[PDB]
């Protein structure tokens, strides 16, 4: 019963935290986009998730396993530093920035591969226009596999000759490190820019 009471504290706290963090993220992004529109800070693109599209079937999967969808793509770490200074000086909030010039290391690393139980590689499911942005998505997703369920995930992650990163259609994750993620009723979704 005290566990019942604290369960309710916890749920209330989660709702508060989600609300606050979602507003803060939106506030930070809008501030950054105003600096781009005004031209006060050159070299800003926008959040990575707005630059790709994916089949709705995989909405929960990529939303759950790709934090980088909320990273803000900019030309370089130099521009990232100008943005971070801006956020600090006007006491706006925090964001993570991708230096797009650093993404070029992946240029020849993206070719399709054989996968365990012929599972889809999430990166291949993302539709992108620009090849530099495609490189950024590979940075973000690498060789993440999509599994149908947690059993298949555990099979493809742990049981092969090699470790693989895998997300389930329900948004559970097994990392190459060995960690396992899931639990709760809350579903992450809608973090990609469209469903082309």
């Amino acid at each position: 019963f005290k566990s019942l009471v604290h369960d309710l504290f916890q749920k209330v706290e989660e709702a508060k935290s989600s609300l606050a963090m979602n507003r803060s993220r939106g506030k930070v992004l809008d501030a950054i986009i105003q600096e781009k529109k005004s031209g006060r800070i050159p070299g800003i693109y926008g959040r990575l998730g707005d630059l790709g599209a994916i089949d709705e079937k995989y909405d929960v999967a990529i939303s759950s396993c790709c934090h980088a969808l909320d990273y803000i793509v900019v030309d370089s770490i130099d521009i990232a530093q100008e943005c971070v200074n801006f956020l600090k000086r006007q006491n706006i909030g925090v964001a993570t920035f991708i230096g797009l010039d650093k993404m070029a290391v992946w240029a020849k690393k993206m070719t399709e591969i054989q996968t365990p139980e012929n599972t889809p590689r999430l990166f291949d499911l993302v539709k992108v226009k620009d090849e530099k942005i495609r490189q950024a998505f590979y940075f973000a997703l690498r060789d993440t596999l999509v599994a149908d369920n947690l059993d298949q995930a555990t099979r493809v992650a742990y049981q092969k000759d090699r470790r693989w990163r895998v997300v389930t259609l329900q948004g559970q994750i097994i990392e190459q490190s060995g960690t396992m993620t899931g639990g709760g009723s809350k579903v992450m979704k809608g973090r990609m820019g469209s469903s082309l």
């Binding site: 005290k2 566990s3 604290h6 369960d7 504290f9 916890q10 749920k11 209330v12 706290e13 989660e14 935290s17 930070v28 990273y71 770490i77 990232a80 530093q81 971070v84 956020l87 600090k88 006007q90 006491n91 706006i92 909030g93 925090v94 964001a95 993570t96 920035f97 991708i98 230096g99 010039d101 650093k102 993404m103 940075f139 947690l150 555990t154 742990y158 470790r163 559970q172 994750i173 190459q176 490190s177 060995g178 960690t179 396992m180 993620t181 899931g182 639990g183 709760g184 809350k186």
Partner: protein
């Protein structure tokens, strides 16, 4: 004999007081709590070690914010003995929110090499760069989890040195400043305006002190009661 009976009363009182404090803290900061339903009959609760932040103590408090950002979300990762335990927890544990579980038997991480710290020290000065892991105290049984959370990142004094260390071709290692700016050698920077309110780490510590004192008294009392029972 009466001194033992008074000791029992004293311990019982302290235990009552500590549990009340514990519950007050969790009520004020519900994110400090990790609860789960036993996924089996005869469940060994020792299989679940708890939230990472509940199992450490900051050695250098000037690095509190840096350590918070080194871990990020991983402060709330749950350390367990095996991936088997983890799966049971996810499946049958009735978790009320989303958690990332660290299984001690499977967890793997590339620790910062001594040679790599060496290079960083010569680059920016040994006063200005430390492996994050060296700044936290924890029980040895948790070594592999703590290597994963803190053993792969540098803590530096300022943004300029963090940037120089992170992106040096001999180092190529994640770095965090004292102000909480995070450089990832893959090509990202995270930072901006951060609250000057107390780090959540201070709250975990405050709770840990209560948990630790509670554990000692509950053990004292169990042992004392065993022997009292033995007088008959």
């Amino acid at each position: 004999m009466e001194s033992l009976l008074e000791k029992r009363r004293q311990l019982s009182r302290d235990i009552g007081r500590l549990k009340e404090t514990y519950e007050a803290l969790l009520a004020r900061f519900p994110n400090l709590r990790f609860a789960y339903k036993d996924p089996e009959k005869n469940w060994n609760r020792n299989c679940v070690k708890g939230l990472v932040a509940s199992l450490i103590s900051v050695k250098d408090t000037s690095a509190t914010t840096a350590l918070e950002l080194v871990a990020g979300e991983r402060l709330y990762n749950v350390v367990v003995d095996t991936e088997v335990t983890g799966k049971k927890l996810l499946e049958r544990g009735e978790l009320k929110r989303r958690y990332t579980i660290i299984p001690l038997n499977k967890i793997s991480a590339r620790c910062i090499a001594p040679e790599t710290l060496r290079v960083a020290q010569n680059l920016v000065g040994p006063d200005n760069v430390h492996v994050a892991l060296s700044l936290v105290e924890y029980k040895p049984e948790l070594q592999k989890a703590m290597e994963f959370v803190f053993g792969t990142t540098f803590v530096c004094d300022n943004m300029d040195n963090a940037k120089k260390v992170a992106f040096d071709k001999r180092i190529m290692t994640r770095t965090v400043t004292l102000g909480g700016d995070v450089f990832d050698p893959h090509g990202t920077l995270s930072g901006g305006a951060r609250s000057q309110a107390a780090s959540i780490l201070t709250k975990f510590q405050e709770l840990k002190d209560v948990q630790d004192e509670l554990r000692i008294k509950e053990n004292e009392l169990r042992a004392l009661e065993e022997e009292l029972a033995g007088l008959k």
